Symmetry: D2
Subunit: 121 residues, 4 copies
């Protein structure tokens, strides 16, 4: 398993020690508070009221937690994933990323705390 | 394992099929959007800024997900619990509840989607 | 989890730390060599060529590993059980026992090494 | 998880759907009755009284269940493995094999039934 934090201000994200392999079942739980610029903070689902003006992941809200597995495209994580198997082909290290518009991370603040583990399969 | 929905306006809570037994380890993941009255909605951690006005659980925010286990007090859940063991002498049926003030549930809306599993031991 | 040894010559068997509760999924693995009297030894499946002359479990061979759960009848274990769920209404402490004819355990020798754990469920 | 049979007379063994990856924890349970030639049969630990005449696995008895992982040498399985981690530098598909002398498999009989799964990590 892996525990750690993802900073809202880091366009490169946080690499983990979890290597996702074909067939793996994983569980992720995410918590905490972050902002993409405003004084308000949101949880790991982000801001449901904010439009997409060029986010790295178009399938989650601005301010959400997302990931990449190897050199996949972005995959939504939000509050987490329960006994989840990847939409197929994907493989590699899990990198966690805060969803914002590239070039605009400089006004971001806060972080998410994240646990990941592999399940029975 | 159990999957289901906890309505924000259900004061009595959602009774699950999980009986927490001595020594059990469990994982919970919660998602969704709900409100304790305002037009804005919050995720399962609730609203960090709203003051505690006699919530059923003093150790979680207004609009957070909490639970009881048998005769326990309320216990916080938020976005979830990762490979977690309960307080000494707590056991029995898990009921999931939206954290609000008694008698003030009638203006609530939305729901949280929740999964609960037992882990290896 | 429980890890230990089940002696062939112990008619009362071995009361483990594992309390089987409704819905639990368990794994048991058993290894080793034991005898119900002869100079030869058999593994946890016992002696397939030996007749049943009043065995405590009629559904496994003389010299096999079996168990009781709470106040159940004997249940075959053999080399182990993989992600196993008990029949309805069976619950309580797991006792491991060597399968022999009652009153004939005194000439027995050897033991099985046994691991029991609760699995995800 | 994989469930299947391993024929005692199959010198190439039985390839499974399990790909062992670094960090994986697995469980195996094996059952059944097989022979390397005599009319008598033995369980998955094999025959403790027979000498090694050039077995594919010198670390288990003739008639025992063994395995290979990818390009590995033979590793004992016997009655099974509980929440087991492979040696470092061992990875790839699991193949199950009956322990006999190469070229002498043709007079073998019976089989072992085997379950393999990946466990929480
Ligand atoms: C100035 C500010 O502009 C936006 S918030 C804005 O969001 C983008 C993503 O869409 C980037 O993260 C920027 O860094 C953020 O500042 C308005 O919603 C806000 O009300 C305010 O006017
Ligand atoms: C009228 C309303 O009052 C509160 S919201 C209020 O919160 C309590 C819990 O503290 C109960 O759930 C009520 O049912 C809710 O209406 C203010 O924060 C809000 O701005 C508004 O004035
Ligand atoms: C003829 C037979 O010889 C052996 S059994 C023998 O074992 C080897 C492995 O050591 C091969 O599997 C052969 O296929 C087997 O036949 C004696 O132990 C037996 O009593 C009998 O004389
Ligand atoms: O049938 C069981 C019986 O088998 C014979 S050979 C043993 O000597 C006895 O002690 C008893 O275990
Ligand atoms: Ca920003
Ligand atoms: Ca309310
Ligand atoms: Ca005896
Ligand atoms: Ca042979
Ligand atoms: Cl806080």
């Amino acid at each position: 398993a892996w525990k750690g934090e993802v900073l809202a201000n880091n366009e490169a994200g946080q690499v983990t020690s979890i290597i996702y392999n074909p067939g793996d079942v994983i569980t992720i739980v995410a918590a905490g508070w972050a902002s993409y610029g405003p004084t308000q903070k949101w949880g790991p689902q982000g801001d449901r009221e904010h439009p997409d003006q060029g986010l790295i992941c178009h399938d989650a809200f601005c301010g959400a937690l997302v990931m990449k597995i190897g050199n996949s495209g972005t995959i939504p994580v939000n509050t987490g994933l329960f006994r989840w198997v990847a939409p197929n082909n994907v493989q590699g290290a899990i990198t966690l990323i805060y969803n914002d518009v590239p070039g605009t991370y400089g006004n971001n603040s806060g972080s998410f705390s994240v646990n990941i583990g592999k399940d029975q399969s």
